[PDB]
């Protein structure tokens, strides 16, 4: 059954889409005299039993000037794909570190179907706990060859797709007071194309397929990721399932939701943000990049839209710091 | 059996690698006043029975000046993954079109394990045949809304990984005189990290795993891609298998082999090139980018190395045009 779902996953993943008419894109040309920056990185184990590693990134010139804020980045891949070492994610983290002048933490987490939800969320908490342990023990001085100065009072979680869901789950666990990791303080959450789900479809979900994502593919991720027999209204997929925690009573930190206008997941993401907005006490910014599909910010690093996302995350961080 | 291999593929694909020590990368900063260019693209069916599509790309300002050369780009993915519509490949083709001032043809091809080799090679030939048909029938005028001027006497095949293997297979079929498609003339082949295989391992193949590729992953691709019971010395994997055509007697067009210095596939690629070099009558350039892993040219578009690959392909094209 799982093995059949895996064969079907391969087919859906590489099916792609067909444009109905001709289109135009803008491409940045090679130009000499580019501005450059160095980023130091290394891997270390954060969970010995599961052999889970994270990658630490430090922008070199920026760490000489002041104490760095921390960005914990959770990669996408529908809970089924991805690694911190994949060029796609590594490149994005290099950009996060240099552009935001931040120490970036990029963890692996256990993947479905071998490890169904909530394994990924458990791993995400172990990452934050590992960070707590490093913070209270002067572990930071041993991260790199030289010294590193980190401000654990300014931590931000940036989640891409499945990682955006992970970010929400953390936001709830912290906001409910269930876990508490002083002196680690997560001041804000960035949810980028967050992989939320529902048994019932939104309008965008019934819309045209994307360059890579289709509704069929998204459904398959949930089928492989959710516990056997769960529906897409399970709280690990749907933040507003009938069981899902009453977020009125929870104190969520500021949230930034960023989505492409042409994304299948746009409506659920917008609905998520505006339900939070209305609840009051909740600072939630919703930002929609017109005509963009899922993961535009990392799929097209040279693009104007990708650069704008980085500036907005930076502004968000500055405002809360 | 195939279903088990599929479950194991998922695990290997997202396993990644662990750096033994700290490293440094250079990252291009956001800079205003970037140079830009528009690229028109559209999809069309090239094989109705298999519902196989290709994407056509035209740089707009460049097509006003002269007749465009043609670049047929075959995407990578180990014969198991990929689509012309995937952002990663679409972005690379936008770059090829604009940087090389070329009409780019980017086809899907059938993927394993559902469609084992030589399905992909059959599809590659149907692409070239489709191009022949368009060329002799003034199909080009109906490609886009406006007119397009194409020089079918200057076609180049650019293959990435699995696509590099496809490029080799085409080079042999054309060079042997087995297929002939005047007025389509393929003047040269670019093999980028070509996915060649062998039962016996090279030194690089036994070396450290990469950010994404491992020897285990590569073996799994062959297991899923080759016909049931074939070994990695089958001619569809190993250009110099004991059955593989005697390339001394074949008239190969000029070839450019481009590989990363830190690639698992570097030795087999180098061995391939130097065996051809010695055969005589064969113009083969071998270029190794020190310290780079597989697909550096498309995984890091902003990087210096990626830009240099584009310049070299362009120079290669200019020299042969």
From Swiss-Prot, chains A, B:
GO terms for molecular function: carboxylesterase activity. It catalyses: (-)-2'-epi-GR24 + H2O = (-)-2'-epi-GR24 ABC-rings + 5-hydroxy-3-methylfuran-2(5H)-one; 5-deoxystrigol + H2O = 5-deoxystrigol ABC-rings + 5-hydroxy-3-methylfuran-2(5H)-one; orobanchol + H2O = orobanchol ABC-rings + 5-hydroxy-3-methylfuran-2(5H)-one. Its EC number is 3.1.1.-. Changing residue 263 to A: Abolishes the hydrolysis of the synthetic pro-fluorescent probe Yoshimulactone Green (YLG), commonly used for the measurement of SL hydrolysis. A motif (Involved in the stabilization of the negatively charged intermediate by the formation of the oxyanion hole) lies at residues 75-77. Keywords: Cytoplasm, Hydrolase, Nucleus, Serine esterase. Belongs to the 'GDXG' lipolytic enzyme family. Binds to strigolactones (SLs) such as (-)-2'-epi-GR24(4DO), 5-deoxystrigol (5DS) and orobanchol, and catalyzes their hydrolysis; SL are phytohormones controlling shoot branching and communications between plants and microorganisms. Promotes shoot branching by dampening SL-inhibited axillary bud outgrowth. This is Strigolactones hydrolase CXE15. The lineage of its organism: Eukaryota, Viridiplantae, Streptophyta, Embryophyta, Tracheophyta.
